[PDB]
């Protein structure tokens, strides 16, 4: 059955207040957690003329009476597309040196084989990165569709064909997946070989256990703890990474935020496609029926009604797309801050 209940805010606990007693840790653990941030969203361009008018000269001539609105919407979408690449570079373009991955994958007991790229795969991705790419589902199998295939009837009614026919164009990103993986790999090699020195400027080699010793000193724990228990620490680190790989592989919703971004843009474009079919008060949703059955002045009245309908639809889409773009910009700025502040 369906059960209704009062929510539990959390487990109850207590801590004694004793003016002559303290608690002190005697042991410790290395914990590995994840953080997920959107960086970019699909770049979309819309041909407002093809969308509004079905290659109708009369419709086009009427559209010219509102042409600056069509141009303005195109400009707003272009600006959004430009911002997506700016955001991508700001998150992933802080280091202008590409460091080679060392041939060694195990440094002082710390196993990075699941973090560093696997050179034997077509995609220079780590097993964890490969899992990340195998969880988010993208409807667009690349950016080139061509005119063929879509020429005939698609039994599945593949949405990309319909969207492109109505003037909705999906643009490629400026940076490819290989370029991003290469950049990230360079950052991992940078930190592993030189700690944080490569962020501030030149990369100074430091043995990995000494980078950890400095990090412990930063925590407020003597270097002795790391050197005394180095093997235990390395074992906990390696186990924590294995746990991350299993956690990501096991949970289908681990990357839900990114799927939600993709789904929101897919729904917005399917919404425009469905809204194209509305009558908007006209005798027919199809422009060719109006032109075929009505004379010029009556066709112009019904066409003007359809033009108003479609133009309002596009403006609504652009406004919502721009607000989502603003949310992506805020997310990208946070991601870039985390990159510089937490990684470097």
């Amino acid at each position: 059955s369906i059960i209704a209940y009062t929510m539990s805010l959390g487990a109850e606990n207590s801590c004694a207040y004793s003016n002559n007693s303290i608690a002190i840790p005697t042991n410790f653990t290395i914990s590995v957690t994840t953080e997920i941030l959107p960086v970019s969203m699909t770049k979309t361009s819309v041909d407002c003329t093809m969308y509004i008018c079905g290659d109708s000269t009369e419709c086009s001539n009427l559209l010219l009476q509102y042409g600056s609105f069509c141009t303005q919407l195109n400009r707003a979408l272009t600006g959004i597309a430009v911002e997506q690449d700016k955001n991508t570079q700001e998150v992933f373009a802080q280091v202008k040196q590409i460091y080679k991955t060392p041939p060694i994958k195990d440094f002082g007991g710390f196993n990075f084989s699941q973090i560093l790229p696997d050179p034997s795969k077509p995609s220079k991705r780590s097993p964890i990165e490969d899992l990340l790419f195998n969880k988010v589902t993208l409807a667009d199998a690349g950016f080139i569709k061509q005119y063929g295939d879509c020429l005939g009837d698609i039994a599945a009614r593949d949405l990309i064909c319909a969207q492109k026919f109505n003037g909705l164009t999906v643009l490629p990103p400026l940076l490819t997946d290989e370029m991003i993986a290469q950049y990230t790999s360079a950052l991992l090699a940078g930190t592993i070989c030189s700690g944080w020195t490569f962020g501030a400027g030149p990369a100074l080699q430091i043995p990995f256990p000494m980078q950890m010793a400095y990090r412990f000193n930063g925590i407020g724990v003597t270097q002795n703890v790391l050197y005394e228990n180095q093997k235990l620490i390395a074992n906990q680190f390696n186990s924590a990474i294995g746990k991350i790989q299993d956690s990501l592989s096991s949970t289908p919703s681990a990357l839900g935020k990114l799927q939600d971004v993709v789904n929101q843009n897919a729904q917005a474009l399917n919404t425009l496609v469905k809204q194209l079919s509305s009558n908007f008060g006209a005798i027919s949703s199809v422009l060719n029926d109006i032109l075929s059955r009505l004379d010029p002045p009556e066709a112009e009245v019904q066409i003007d009604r359809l033009i108003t309908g479609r133009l309002q639809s596009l403006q609504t889409y652009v406004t919502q797309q721009l607000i989502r773009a603003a949310e992506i910009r805020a997310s990208a700025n946070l991601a870039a801050t985390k990159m510089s502040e937490c990684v470097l």
Binding site: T49, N74, G167, S292, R293, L294, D295, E298
Partner: protein
């Protein structure tokens, strides 16, 4: 020139400008209709000997014929010819189902 026109400028700055689409134009007109050879019975409709009383009006179906309204121009003068579903000038371009 297309870019210059789009930006309302005779100077274009360095960059990429999106400028409408490459469109294929039709090369021929293909018209298909059923091969209907009979003329519609305009004589029976307009040259009838008698019309039914309005209280007991008649209706008949017209099918399998070609409609041509120019035949009436030299037949009778009409006081009313008002079309609501279709403009008169487009009547010859349509085909009807009932």
């Amino acid at each position: 020139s297309e870019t210059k026109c789009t930006l309302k400028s005779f100077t274009v700055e360095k960059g990429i400008y999106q400028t409408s689409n490459f469109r294929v134009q039709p090369t021929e007109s293909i018209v298909r209709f059923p091969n209907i050879t009979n003329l519609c019975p305009f004589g029976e409709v307009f040259n009838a000997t008698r019309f039914a009383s309005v209280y007991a009006w008649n209706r008949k179906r017209i099918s399998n014929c070609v409609a041509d309204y120019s035949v009436l121009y030299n037949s009778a003068s009409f006081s009313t010819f008002k079309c609501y579903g279709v403009s008169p000038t487009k009547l010859n371009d349509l085909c009807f189902t009932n």
